[PDB]
Amino acid sequence: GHLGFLPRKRAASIRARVKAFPKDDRSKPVALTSFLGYKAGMTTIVRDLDRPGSKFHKREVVEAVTVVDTPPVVVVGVVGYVETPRGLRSLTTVWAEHLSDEVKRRFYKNWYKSKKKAFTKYSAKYAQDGAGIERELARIKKYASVVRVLVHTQIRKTPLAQKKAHLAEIQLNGGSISEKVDWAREHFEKTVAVDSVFEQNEMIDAIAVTKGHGFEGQRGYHSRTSINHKIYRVGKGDDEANGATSFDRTKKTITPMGGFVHYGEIKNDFIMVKGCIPGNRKRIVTLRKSLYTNTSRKALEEVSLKWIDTASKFGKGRFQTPAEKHAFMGTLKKDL
Amino acid sequence: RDGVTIEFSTNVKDEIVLSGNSVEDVSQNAADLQQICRVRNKDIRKFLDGIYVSHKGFITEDL
RNA sequence: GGCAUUGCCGCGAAGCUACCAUCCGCUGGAUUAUGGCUGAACGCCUCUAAGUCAGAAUCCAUGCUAGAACGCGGUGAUGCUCCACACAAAGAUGGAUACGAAUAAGGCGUCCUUGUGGCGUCGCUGAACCAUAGCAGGCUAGCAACGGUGCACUUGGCGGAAAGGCCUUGGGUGCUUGCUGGCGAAUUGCAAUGUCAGCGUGGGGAUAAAUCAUUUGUAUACGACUUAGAUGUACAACGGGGUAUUGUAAGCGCUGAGAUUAAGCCUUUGUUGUCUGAUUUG
């Protein structure tokens, strides 16, 4: 096979890492340069599209897709990175002076036996007349060409409960670092939804480790990188009729009847994308937006759904909604 | 570049005058025009219609 | 039900698979031949000698994969206390003494308008420059001068390329060799440097951990890895239920009904039950 990927052995990390970022621009708003999802479930969608000159033009089309569960994510702290003729370097990590439980849980491998004394010095000491982050943060103001921001999920808000929340950082594409740093300073002890982050017809990336199988080198369980995935539908986790298209106009929960395979329903937004999102199921995945300007007739297009698959795909997928399901079944044995 | 005065010449159809100070630069971008017009792959003299530099000289006259 | 080596026809979730299904699969430089620009060599020219503008399926960046198990940064917790006993309360001996840029040229002072300016001058060694006397640097008298210098308090600002460095303000404290005083030194006997670079032990007490173990499954041959385990949507199970596998069940049409159902499906207003062992580290 390719000598691209060498050497052979496993990806040492359960969560992958982000090895690139979109360059930056000084004249933009402060922008959230990337985000990370949870792939939950595979499915298939029918739709039609506008692609002039292609043989599918104005022509009803069917293709499978991938869904990714996406909790709106909560932000604690900022670290600016100085640049040095070696590499970057951190200056100081900062936080929200109140942290959620789970991010506390990231700092203990044994939670129950521990004393939960973690932050008291740092998070308590900031309670005061101030200056807590003043000196350091203004230092970031002076130094630190590039700036990143701590981001961490709420997994109590996901049906798979490990109680423990991951940490990551994301850059900021704004400029004149003051309204960068102030930005997230304003966003300390806050959350940031996916609204202002992405929108449809935008190519991005989501990649992660892939499906550990076993030992016969060691096959799989690598974080590979698959770019160019067109988001068909930007979900909203409060949206009734999850799968409401430009066609269907009937009520369906994107979580099927009886639930997803190994899942409860969807409490937060999601991204449906074509093709494949690497890994095995139940996965935490990385999302990097284009790294550059891709603009072309290919990426400027506009998706038009027909029907989204809400069927329960355990066994052969058959019905869709329990109302229609129970109209076609009619009365069962004990029903009515 | 800078330092090039460009004009689409009137009193002569099908011609253009570029002038300036630096020999290097005026003939630099003149050569750069005649070589964006390269006709390969095909018959060489098929169209002797092409892009040429007709005049090489000064602005003044009588200097 | 069992054997008929997983009993055959038929059904099959799931797991695992298939160019037998689908997705997706980098953007800029540097270049060679080539075409030249400019212009000698060569009083013609010339892509070339100096200098040059484009350009390859290449090379390098751009993007991708890992991440030094003696590569490194950021921050989160407490390492503390007692007793017993051990170091100390790859080569020093004045000073590592800071523009930058050219070298067919530059500093320094200065002139005036502010220059690509004028004037002077410097270099041709750091052999320079500062510092330097006092028992290895004592104890004591003043003369001048308000210095220089130490130390500790101390203002203020700068330095994040490894900043941990530098300046600075303000008092006190000592010093003084800028000047002139007075007492001390031996006997180390004529050399054999003859001086002047808080700290771990091991056993308690306590702080925060981490590990084994246990459970789980995204992992897995062992490893190794990911969850949960402190009184809660904690966990575990039954059942409430929901999908769906299954093809009409003992038995008097009843019945697309039955049996199974997370052990690698799901939501759990209820029920029943559990909730802290050992080991080491800081």
Helices, strands, pairings?
This is part of a larger assembly, with chains A (336 residues) and B (63 residues).
Chain A lengths: L33 E16 L11 E10 L2 E11 L4 E3 L10 H5 L14 H6 L8 H9 L3 E7 L14 E5 L6 H10 L2 E3 L10 E5 L21 E6 L34 E6 L8 E6 L14 E6 L13 H8 L7
Antiparallel strand pairs in A: 1-2, 1-11, 1-12, 2-10, 3-4, 3-5, 3-7, 5-6, 8-9, 8-11, 9-10
Chain B lengths: L3 E5 L7 E5 L2 H12 L29
Antiparallel strand pairs in B: 1-2
Chain A binds one RNA strand of 282 nucleotides through strand 2, strand 3, strand 4 and helix 2.
Protein name (chain A): Large ribosomal subunit protein uL3
Organism (chain A): Saccharomyces cerevisiae (strain ATCC 204508 / S288c) (Baker's yeast)
Keywords (chain A): Cytoplasm, Isopeptide bond, Methylation, Phosphoprotein, Ribonucleoprotein, Ribosomal protein, Ubl conjugation
Describe this structure in words.
The structure is cut from a larger assembly and holds chains A (336 residues) and B (63 residues). In chain A, 11% of the residues lie in helices and 25% in strands. Chain A has 336 residues and is of the alpha+beta class. In chain A, the strands form 2 sheets. A 6-stranded antiparallel beta barrel of chain A has the order 1-2-10-9-8-11. The termini of chain A are far apart. In chain A, a hairpin with a 4-residue loop joins strand 3 (73-83) and strand 4 (88-90). Chain B is an alpha+beta fold and 63 residues long. Chain B is 19% helix and 16% strand. Chain B is built from 1 helix and 2 strands. A two-stranded antiparallel ribbon of chain B has the order 1-2. Chain B is globular and about 45 Å long. The two termini of chain B are 26 Å apart. In chain B, 0% of the residues are buried. The chains hardly touch. Chain A binds one RNA strand of 282 nucleotides through strand 2, strand 3, strand 4 and helix 2.
Distance between the termini of chain B: 26 Å
Secondary-structure element series of chain B: EEH
Percentage of residues in helical conformation of chain B: 10-25%
Strand order of the largest sheet of chain B: 1-2
| Integer-rounded radius of gyration of chain A | 23 Å
- Secondary-structure content class of chain B: alpha+beta
Strand order of the largest sheet of chain A: 1-2-10-9-8-11
Overall spatial form of chain A = globular
Which range best describes the helical content of chain A: under 10%, 10-25%, 25-40%, 40-55%, 55-70% or over 70%? 10-25%
Instruction: Please report the first level of CATH classification, the CATH class of the largest domain in chain A.
Output: Mainly Beta
Order of helices and strands of chain A: EEEEHHHEEHEEEEEEH
The biggest sheet of chain A amounts to:
6 strands, antiparallel, barrel
Number of helices of chain B: 1
Oligomer: part of a larger assembly
PDB class: ribosome
Keywords: ribosome, pre-60S, pre-ribosome, protein-RNA complex
Entry title: Cryo-EM structure of a nucleolar pre-60S ribosome (Rpf1-TAP)
Chain A: 60S ribosomal protein L3
